[PDB]
Write an enzyme that holds these catalytic residues in place. Structure first.
Site, PDB file in Angstrom:
ATOM      1  N   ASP F  39     -37.188 -36.479 -29.834  1.00  0.00           N
ATOM      2  CA  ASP F  39     -36.636 -37.808 -29.635  1.00  0.00           C
ATOM      3  C   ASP F  39     -37.741 -38.849 -29.774  1.00  0.00           C
ATOM      4  OD1 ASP F  39     -34.493 -39.666 -28.890  1.00  0.00           O
ATOM      5  OD2 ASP F  39     -35.575 -39.885 -26.994  1.00  0.00           O
TER       6      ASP F  39
HETATM    7  C1  LIG Z   1     -44.277 -46.713 -11.195  1.00  0.00           C
HETATM    8  C2  LIG Z   1     -43.650 -47.433 -12.386  1.00  0.00           C
HETATM    9  C3  LIG Z   1     -42.682 -48.501 -11.883  1.00  0.00           C
HETATM   10  C4  LIG Z   1     -41.665 -48.837 -12.973  1.00  0.00           C
HETATM   11  C5  LIG Z   1     -41.016 -47.553 -13.482  1.00  0.00           C
HETATM   12  C6  LIG Z   1     -39.801 -47.890 -14.339  1.00  0.00           C
HETATM   13  C7  LIG Z   1     -38.641 -48.297 -13.434  1.00  0.00           C
HETATM   14  C8  LIG Z   1     -37.472 -48.787 -14.286  1.00  0.00           C
HETATM   15  C9  LIG Z   1     -37.183 -47.783 -15.399  1.00  0.00           C
HETATM   16  C10 LIG Z   1     -36.388 -48.470 -16.504  1.00  0.00           C
HETATM   17  C11 LIG Z   1     -34.908 -48.484 -16.135  1.00  0.00           C
HETATM   18  C12 LIG Z   1     -34.093 -48.808 -17.383  1.00  0.00           C
HETATM   19  O1  LIG Z   1     -32.952 -48.497 -17.435  1.00  0.00           O
HETATM   20  S1  LIG Z   1     -34.871 -49.675 -18.775  1.00  0.00           S
HETATM   21  C13 LIG Z   1     -34.470 -48.855 -20.344  1.00  0.00           C
HETATM   22  C14 LIG Z   1     -32.966 -48.897 -20.600  1.00  0.00           C
HETATM   23  N1  LIG Z   1     -32.732 -49.133 -22.011  1.00  0.00           N
HETATM   24  C15 LIG Z   1     -32.070 -48.121 -22.813  1.00  0.00           C
HETATM   25  O2  LIG Z   1     -31.732 -47.106 -22.311  1.00  0.00           O
HETATM   26  C16 LIG Z   1     -31.816 -48.350 -24.301  1.00  0.00           C
HETATM   27  C17 LIG Z   1     -30.671 -47.449 -24.759  1.00  0.00           C
HETATM   28  N2  LIG Z   1     -31.212 -46.170 -25.185  1.00  0.00           N
HETATM   29  C18 LIG Z   1     -31.430 -45.883 -26.593  1.00  0.00           C
HETATM   30  O3  LIG Z   1     -31.155 -46.692 -27.413  1.00  0.00           O
HETATM   31  C19 LIG Z   1     -32.003 -44.529 -27.015  1.00  0.00           C
HETATM   32  O4  LIG Z   1     -31.285 -43.507 -26.382  1.00  0.00           O
HETATM   33  C20 LIG Z   1     -33.482 -44.418 -26.635  1.00  0.00           C
HETATM   34  C21 LIG Z   1     -33.607 -43.938 -25.192  1.00  0.00           C
HETATM   35  C22 LIG Z   1     -34.164 -45.776 -26.776  1.00  0.00           C
HETATM   36  C23 LIG Z   1     -34.187 -43.418 -27.551  1.00  0.00           C
HETATM   37  O5  LIG Z   1     -33.270 -42.797 -28.408  1.00  0.00           O
HETATM   38  P1  LIG Z   1     -33.414 -43.046 -30.032  1.00  0.00           P
HETATM   39  O6  LIG Z   1     -34.681 -43.819 -30.309  1.00  0.00           O
HETATM   40  O7  LIG Z   1     -33.471 -41.717 -30.746  1.00  0.00           O
HETATM   41  O8  LIG Z   1     -32.231 -43.839 -30.532  1.00  0.00           O
END
Ligand SMILES: CCCCCCCCCCCC(=O)SCCNC(=O)CCNC(=O)[C@H](O)C(C)(C)COP(=O)(O)O
Ligand SMILES: NC(=O)C1=CN([C@@H]2O[C@H](COP(=O)(O)OP(=O)(O)OC[C@H]3O[C@@H](n4cnc5c(N)ncnc54)[C@H](OP(=O)(O)O)[C@@H]3O)[C@@H](O)[C@H]2O)C=CC1
Ligand code: SF4
Lengths: 332, 51, 185, 157, 112, 83, 149, 65, 385
Positions: F39
């Site tokens: 991925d």
């Molecule tokens: C200690 C650190 C503190 C912070 C830690 C982080 C805490 C928050 C974490 C973020 C929470 C969220 O949802 S932020 C991220 C949410 N955004 C998405 O999920 C975009 C939709 N996903 C897709 O397009 C694809 O599945 C993809 C996964 C990109 C890849 O697959 P491909 O490229 O093959 O297409």
């Protein structure tokens, strides 16, 4: 023995469980955790105390409002014990002393008080669950005087009440334990940690919250716990050497051991034995060099291979290397 | 699981002013009694939001 | 100087494509504009000679769960030179970012942070858009209509854990809502 | 017990007299009850006259007056300040907000009583409590201190 | 610095997701020093935790929702970087973790 | 410059820690996202692990260019900082 | 009838009617209106099993279910009878019917009209004229019924 | 308690004194408690409480009738 | 440069102050105030209360100036209701608003002087503060949180001797101000600790939303009691002091002059206060007399409805601002036609003043930050609701 609990909430601070417990000796080390876990389910806890009124002050935060009701008593008096035990469907005994005060000897503080509590529970019919907390090495043949008294209290409480469970834990580790903390105090005050048996005796330390959770699970059982003697011990069989090394890991100090044979530590702890009597009844309590505790470190204290343990209550003890010993960072 | 409904006119009054509005009923029935003063305790955040 | 004069002058001078709703009353002369013309409108109203609005009193949000554009952002403005007040409003939902006005009015930073904290509306080109009022690690925006009054979590001291901890809320006495509405209103 | 019942009693009375005559509170001003605390220590009521003098740091204070609304963000700091005072310490809750949440009891960011964070010895009711009400609360705390028997209990164990 | 303008397509949302994930990964060493996490957690278990959160929020197809999720994650990361949150909070959230479910729920309470 | 042996070992070792990557398929020429069916999150995770086993940094414009382990190991062998 | 239950906490205070032009039309009976008193009296709240002497003792849910499940396997399949009450809802009746059918029995019925009535066609046990449709009737013939009670 | 007039005596033995003020007031309505064992800080009955706090001008003997 | 933390928990400086200072040497380069320690959710709690039930919330916003917030809330409700207030009630409201302004100015000046290190003027001022809190305790039943000013008229009438006692107070408050001024104004240490400290230009004050003494210290003659007069403020004679340099010393001088002018306004209100009734005669919005509720059926019905449901404000929204002692205090009230406010934003002057602490304190000594904080007269009850 079902009928001692009736959930009336979401199992939170303001929830209601049908448990009204009288925890004797809850102002010590284990009581601070047992009362906290009892109050979390919404169980009303009566905390009988003696002496200063500041001793049970920290336990009022645990209940919601009126859940924790400290009451003064005197173990010598019998009417006070009955008064502080009336409104109670469960009685938990935690009263015990590892050293000797002239007012309350080894037998008085460990056997006679438990016997009186068991009796008062006997005439005051209505306590559905009774729990008495002895020590893991409790045996009549044990050279240590404290352990023998605890064993005698065990037969006393079984004779006075066959339904009483006997939780029998091992050396406890926690924020206010009397094994890791005195060691670190000695290290920070004198630079070296003495080894009374040369760091050879093997025992099974247990994290105190695990013991409190075991008592809670025994209270909230299916009825199998009644009239049983559990032996609560940690997962790893350590020794006085390995635990001291773990402490140095947490304290972040260069190890420095002074090996001491048994006779020299026995004779150096002897002065406090024949100096119990003096113009003052109080005397500086022993910290690491209790004669009784040294005698307790002469025979290895392990959980019996043919006795009940944590896994018979559906519990898993914490590993005494990470979270259980994280309190030692205060001396780092 | 919620119920979307329009509350109806009360039977004890003939006025029709509190009608036409729609509400979401969260079915928040988990309540008990405080065993110190008899007050109604709850552990549900959506106890009265929809009302 | 007055509501009768400002209304006509802004009717004539302002570009028509900016404002889409003009109320002239004694409660206050309001302007309703699209979120993509807010910055332009306020920059015009801050620099023009006959509409010298140099004080941004506050920025507030209003929650209307029954509308498609849920949140209403209100800009209360003051003109010290002409002794007049102007109110400008826009509308945004939960997932659109409206332009920030910190460039024009430096004081707008804290009210924009408060609006983001209380309603969840994000502002483009804001130097630092982080919560200003709620507790650290707060989840949810309290000033929304669907947010419960007492919240979701509760704070208490845990003696075994030796720190102040957060737990799911459990009231000893729930909030009693009294319905005083009359059917003859 | 020919003299223990007497000498221990007198030494304990001396201890209690010292503790009642010299109380050094740490005023934890949080809201409009801070104005009432300032009025209490001013010229009209003269909290100093009883020996009470306020202190800035918890290292030197044996009492702690929580007077104001305790929020969720402020409770860890409250507990940290409390944990820094020496052992013979007492906490006085002043006003409805410190007692049980008060007028913000049903708020999402208010601790419903400072007794959920620290153990409270005296509750002073009011919103805000009168300065004489705070005087009565301090006098009640003094009365409670005189009930302590530290040396006798130490002897009895 | 300033909050970025709202995205216009899913490719920009994916690029911002990757940028935020990389920023969180570069933020890992700092947390190991601000909080005593040296002898607590491996430097890859946290990485897997953020990866799992991104993957379980990966069914979103709205670029605005993705941007808001990224913004909230960045706010959480900035809060964790500072000493604002308590130590056990991140350990309480950022750690990776028999008859029938119905019968256990039935024995527990009537409200499922 | 660095010899090919050690960089090949360091790129062949860390790739087997994804609980799905087949040890039999990893080789000096094995693309991450294409040959192993990875991925894009794993496509950036491999690059992050490259800077997780050392202190150097990969700019955001040097991560999405070529997802091939042969060019990755060539770049690693051309990393003066590492040893 | 469509009612409106008003409650103050965990208890029901009163019951008042609710508009339904097809069933009750703003009215309810006295039995409906003042039945809320019985909801807080003599309420069974704990599983209970008789003792050797013949007294009920409060028992946990797990043990009562264990007892009934142990006794249900000791009887012949056709010896099992399940009777639903008059206040039962449809889902619980369906579950009871399924449970009794799987055990090998077929004796499931309701409190009242369950003496062997043929429910095969659904017009033979229903008001084929709606209640609100009775307003167009010119002649009522009540055969062995007392609608007043 | 010097140059002062005793207004009245209470059922508990408390004595109430009064002094005349001109422009700044001070020590014009106070109590000499009949006890000395810490005096409990609250021993004034309802009939004398109003007079002490200047709520009412009635002494308290007149408030009884 | 390193990162510094001033959290004074003791109320020797506010009490919930949290400054994160970035200091290069002894200078401060940025001041980032962390607020939210006194955010009690007041704005959300208003939406769950009746218009009458939400009045005491405004007492506890700026708890040094209690009557100022009640006056603003009442004026907003009257504006949304078109309720006329009798002249005597208006005079009483103006009189007590000016008493409140004097109280706030005294507390601000002397708490600021105590932070600098002048311990004596603090108790001298709190004596007069006690004297005025006596007047609050007489008309209402509370020394501080007096729910006296109410949307219709005022809660209840004045006792007999209040006017005479207030006149006796005003006979000597001038000398009290004179002594306090003699302690501080001519002193060279006081001049050296305030002169050229915290200078703000008029453009900066306008851009950052400054109001009141903060704005008028920069030369801007903007008083809300003269620009948008309310109640009977246009029938009273008083001057508006204006600064020249914008430093902390001009703020102090203007704070003295404003309190003298408030004394003047109080005297005029006492002399010109007329007779009449103290509430609107529309009993649909104000409570009936206790003798009328127990004797008339309609009065009892009005009492019942008012004390259960309250009045209903027609659906509208407006922003009303008054000249609070701190500055411009505004209430943005939104009504949907029910008995409870739909939205009520509280525009606190201390919010915009504590926001501007970053630029006033830049390139200043660490010991000057306390003076910069104390000259703004900030209380955190209003900063974070
Ligand atoms: C200690 C650190 C503190 C912070 C830690 C982080 C805490 C928050 C974490 C973020 C929470 C969220 O949802 S932020 C991220 C949410 N955004 C998405 O999920 C975009 C939709 N996903 C897709 O397009 C694809 O599945 C993809 C996964 C990109 C890849 O697959 P491909 O490229 O093959 O297409
Ligand atoms: N490592 C350990 O701590 C181990 C503990 N146990 C057993 O667990 C029990 C409690 O554990 P812990 O709490 O750690 O031990 P503590 O000594 O900390 O508990 C002491 C309690 O006993 C009370 N007590 C002692 N003597 C008397 C007396 N004569 N009359 C009345 N009350 C008395 C104390 O009250 P006050 O403080 O007011 O005297 C205090 O509440 C003890 O029985 C102990 O033997 C078992 C194995 C090891
Ligand atoms: S109790 Fe009343 S006066 Fe005291 S802080 Fe709370 S609201 Fe303010």
């Amino acid at each position: 023995g079902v009928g001692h609990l009736a959930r009336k909430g979401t199992g939170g601070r303001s929830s209601v469980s049908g448990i009204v417990a009288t925890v004797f000796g809850a102002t010590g080390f284990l009581g601070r955790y047992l009362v906290q876990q009892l109050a979390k389910m919404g169980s009303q806890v009566l905390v009988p105390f003696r002496g200063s009124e500041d001793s049970p002050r920290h336990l009022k935060l645990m209940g919601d409002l009126g859940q924790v009701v400290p009451m003064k008593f005197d173990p010598r008096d019998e009417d006070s014990i009955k008064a502080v035990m009336a409104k109670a469907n469960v009685v938990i005994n935690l009263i015990g002393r590892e050293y000797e005060t002239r007012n309350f000897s080894f037998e008085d503080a460990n056997h006679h008080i438990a016997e009186k509590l068991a009796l008062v529970a006997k005439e005051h019919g209505g306590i559905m669950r009774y729990i008495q907390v002895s020590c893991l090495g409790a045996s009549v043949s044990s050279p240590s005087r404290m352990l023998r008294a605890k064993a005698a209290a065990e037969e006393a409480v079984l004779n006075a009440l066959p339904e009483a469970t006997i939780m029998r834990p091992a050396t406890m580790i926690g924020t206010e334990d009397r094994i890791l903390n005195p060691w670190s105090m000695f290290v920070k005050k004198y630079g070296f940690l003495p080894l009374i048996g040369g760091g050879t005796t093997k025992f099974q330390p247990v994290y105190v919250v695990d013991v409190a959770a075991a008592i809670v699970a025994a209270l909230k059982d299916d009825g199998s716990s009644m009239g049983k003697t559990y032996e609560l011990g940690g997962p790893d069989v350590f020794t006085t050497h390995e635990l001291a090394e773990i402490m140095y890991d947490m304290i972040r100090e260069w190890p420095r051991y002074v090996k001491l044979p048994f006779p020299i530590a026995k004779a150096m702890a002897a002065p406090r034995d024949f100096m119990v009597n003096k113009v003052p009844f109080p005397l500086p309590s022993p910290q690491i060099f209790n004669l009784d505790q040294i005698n307790a470190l002469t025979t290895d204290t392990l959980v019996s291979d043919n006795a009940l343990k944590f896994q018979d209550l559906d519990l898993v003890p914490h590993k005494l290397k990470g979270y259980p010993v994280e309190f030692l960072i205060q001396y780092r | 699981k919620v119920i979307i409904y329009s509350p109806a006119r009360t039977a004890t009054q003939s006025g029709s002013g509190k009608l036409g509005k729609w509400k979401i009923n969260f079915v928040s029935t988990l309540k008990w009694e405080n065993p110190l003063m008899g007050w109604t305790s709850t552990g549900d955040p959506y106890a009265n939001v929809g009302d | 100087m007055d509501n009768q004069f400002i209304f006509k002058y802004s009717w004539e001078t302002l570009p028509k494509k900016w404002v889409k709703k003009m109320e002239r009353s004694e409660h206050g002369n309001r302007f309703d504009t699209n979120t993509d013309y807010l910055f332009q409108l306020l920059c015009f109203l801050k620099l023009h000679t006959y509409t010298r609005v140099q004080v941004l009193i506050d920025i507030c949000g209003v929650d209307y769960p029954s509308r498609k554009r849920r949140f209403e952002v209100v800009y209360n403005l003051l003109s010290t030179r002409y002794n007049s007040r102007i109110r400008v409003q826009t509308s945004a939902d939960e997932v659109t970012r409206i332009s920030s006005v910190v460039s024009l009015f430096p004081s707008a930073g804290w009210w924009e942070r408060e609006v983001w904290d209380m309603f969840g509306v994000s502002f483009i080109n804001h130097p630092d858009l982080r919560r200003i009022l709620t507790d650290y690690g707060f989840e949810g925006h309290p000033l929304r209509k669907d947010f419960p009054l007492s919240g979701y979590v509760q704070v208490r001291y845990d003696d075994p854990e030796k720190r102040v901890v957060s737990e799911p809320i459990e009231m000893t006495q729930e909030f009693r809502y009294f319905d005083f509405a009359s059917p003859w209103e | 017990s020919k003299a223990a019942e007497f000498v221990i009693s007198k030494v304990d009375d001396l201890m209690n007299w010292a503790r009642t005559g010299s109380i050094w509170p740490m005023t934890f001003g949080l809201a409009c009850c801070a104005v009432e605390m300032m009025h209490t220590g001013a010229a009209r009521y003269d909290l100093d006259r009883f020996g009470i003098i306020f202190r800035p740091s918890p290292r030197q204070s044996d009492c702690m007056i929580v007077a104001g609304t305790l929020t969720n963000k402020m409770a860890p700091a409250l507990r940290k300040v409390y944990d820094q005072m020496p052992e013979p310490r007492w906490v006085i809750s002043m006003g409805s907000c410190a007692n049980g949440g008060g007028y913000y009891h049903y708020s999402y960011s208010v601790v419903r009583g400072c007794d959920r964070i620290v153990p409270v010895d005296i509750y002073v009711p009011g919103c805000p409590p009168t300065a004489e009400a705070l005087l009565y609360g301090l006098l009640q705390l003094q009365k409670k201190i005189n009930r302590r028997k530290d040396f006798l209990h130490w002897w009895n164990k | 610095i300033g909050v970025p303008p709202n995205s216009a397509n899913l490719t920009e949302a994916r690029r911002r997701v990757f940028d935020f994930f990389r920023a969180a990964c570069r933020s890992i060493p700092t947390i190991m020093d601000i909080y005593n996490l040296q002898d607590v957690v491996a430097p890859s278990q946290l990485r897997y935790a953020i990866s799992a959160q991104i993957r379980n929020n990966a069914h979103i197809t709205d670029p605005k929702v993705i941007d808001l999720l990224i913004f909230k994650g960045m706010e959480e990361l900035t809060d964790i970087v500072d000493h604002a949150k308590q130590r056990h909070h991140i350990i309480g959230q950022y750690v990776v973790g028999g008859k029938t479910d119905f019968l256990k729920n039935f024995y527990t309470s009537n409200y499922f | 410059f660095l010899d090919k042996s050690e960089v090949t070992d360091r790129v062949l070792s860390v790739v087997k820690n994804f609980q799905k990557v087949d040890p039999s398929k990893v080789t000096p020429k094995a693309n991450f996202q294409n040959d192993l069916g990875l991925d894009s999150l794993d496509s950036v995770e491999v690059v992050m692990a490259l800077e997780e086993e050392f202190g150097f940094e990969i700019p955001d414009n040097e991560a999405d260019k070529i997802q091939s382990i042969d060019l990755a190991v060539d770049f690693i062998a051309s990393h003066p900082q590492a040893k | 009838s469509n009612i409106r239950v008003d409650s103050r906490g965990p208890e029901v205070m009163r019951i008042i009617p609710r508009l339904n032009e097809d069933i009750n039309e703003e009215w309810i009976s006295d039995k409906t209106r003042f039945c809320y008193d019985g909801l807080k009296r003599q309420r069974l709240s704990d599983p209970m099993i008789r003792d050797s002497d013949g007294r009920f003792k409060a028992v946990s849910w797990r043990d009562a279910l264990a007892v009934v499940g142990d006794i249900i396997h000791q009887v012949k399949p056709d010896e099992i009878v399940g009777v639903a009450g008059q206040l039962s809802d449809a889902e619980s009746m369906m579950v009871l019917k399924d449970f009794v059918n799987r055990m090998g029995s077929d004796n499931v019925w309701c409190e009242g009209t369950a003496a062997g009535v043929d429910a095969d066609l659904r017009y033979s046990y229903l008001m084929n004229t709606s209640i609100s449709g009775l307003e167009n009737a010119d002649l009522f013939l009540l055969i062995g019924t007392q609608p007043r009670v | 308690n010097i140059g002062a007039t005793l207004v009245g005596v209470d059922k508990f033995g408390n004595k109430y004194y009064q002094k005349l003020g001109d422009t700044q007031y001070g020590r014009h309505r106070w109590v000499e408690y009949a006890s000395k064992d810490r005096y409990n800080a609250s021993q004034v009955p309802a009939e004398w409480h109003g007079w002490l706090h200047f709520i009412t001008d009635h002494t308290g003997d007149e408030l009884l009738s | 440069n390193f990162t510094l933390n001033f959290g004074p928990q003791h109320p020797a400086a506010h009490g919930v102050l949290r400054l994160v200072l970035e200091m290069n040497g002894e200078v401060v380069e940025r001041a980032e105030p962390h607020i939210g320690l006194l955010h009690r959710g007041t704005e959300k709690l208003i939406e769950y209360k009746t218009y009458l039930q939400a009045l005491p919330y405004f007492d506890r916003l700026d708890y040094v100036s209690m009557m100022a917030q009640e006056h603003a809330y009442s004026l907003a409700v009257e504006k949304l209701l078109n309720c006329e207030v009798p002249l005597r009630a208006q005079y009483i409201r103006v009189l007590f608003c000016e008493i409140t302004r004097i109280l706030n100015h005294l507390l601000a000046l002397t708490t600021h002087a105590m932070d600098v290190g002048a311990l004596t003027p603090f108790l001298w001022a709190f004596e007069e503060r006690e004297k005025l809190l006596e007047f609050y305790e007489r008309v209402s039943g509370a020394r501080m949180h007096a729910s006296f000013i109410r949307p219709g008229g005022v809660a209840q009438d004045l006792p007999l001797g209040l006017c005479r006692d207030i006149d006796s107070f005003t006979q000597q408050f001038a000398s009290r101000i004179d002594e306090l001024e003699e302690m501080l104004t001519g002193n060279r240490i006081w001049k050296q600790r305030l002169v050229d400290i915290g200078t703000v230009t008029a453009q900066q004050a306008k851009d950052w939303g400054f109001s009141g003494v903060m704005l008028r210290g920069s030369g801007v003659c903007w008083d809300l009691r003269r620009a948008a007069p309310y109640d009977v403020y246009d029938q009273l004679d008083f001057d508006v002091p204006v600064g020249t340099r914008g430093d902390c010393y001009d703020r102090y001088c203007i704070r003295i002059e404003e309190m003298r002018q408030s004394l003047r306004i109080i005297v005029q209100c006492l002399n010109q206060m007329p007779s009449g009734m103290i509430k609107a005669d529309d009993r649909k919005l104000c409570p009936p007399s206790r003798c009328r509720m127990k004797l008339s059926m309609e009065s009892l019905i009005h009492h019942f409805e008012l004390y259960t449901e309250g009045f209903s404000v027609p659906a509208s929204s407006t922003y009303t601002a008054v000249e609070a002692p701190k500055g411009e205090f505004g209430v943005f009230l939104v009504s949907n036609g029910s008995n409870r406010p739909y939205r009520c934003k509280i525009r606190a002057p201390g919010f915009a003043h504590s926001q501007g602490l970053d630029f006033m304190s830049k390139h200043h000594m660490l010991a000057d930050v306390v003076t910069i904080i104390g000259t703004q007269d900030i209380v955190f009850g209003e900063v974070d609701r």
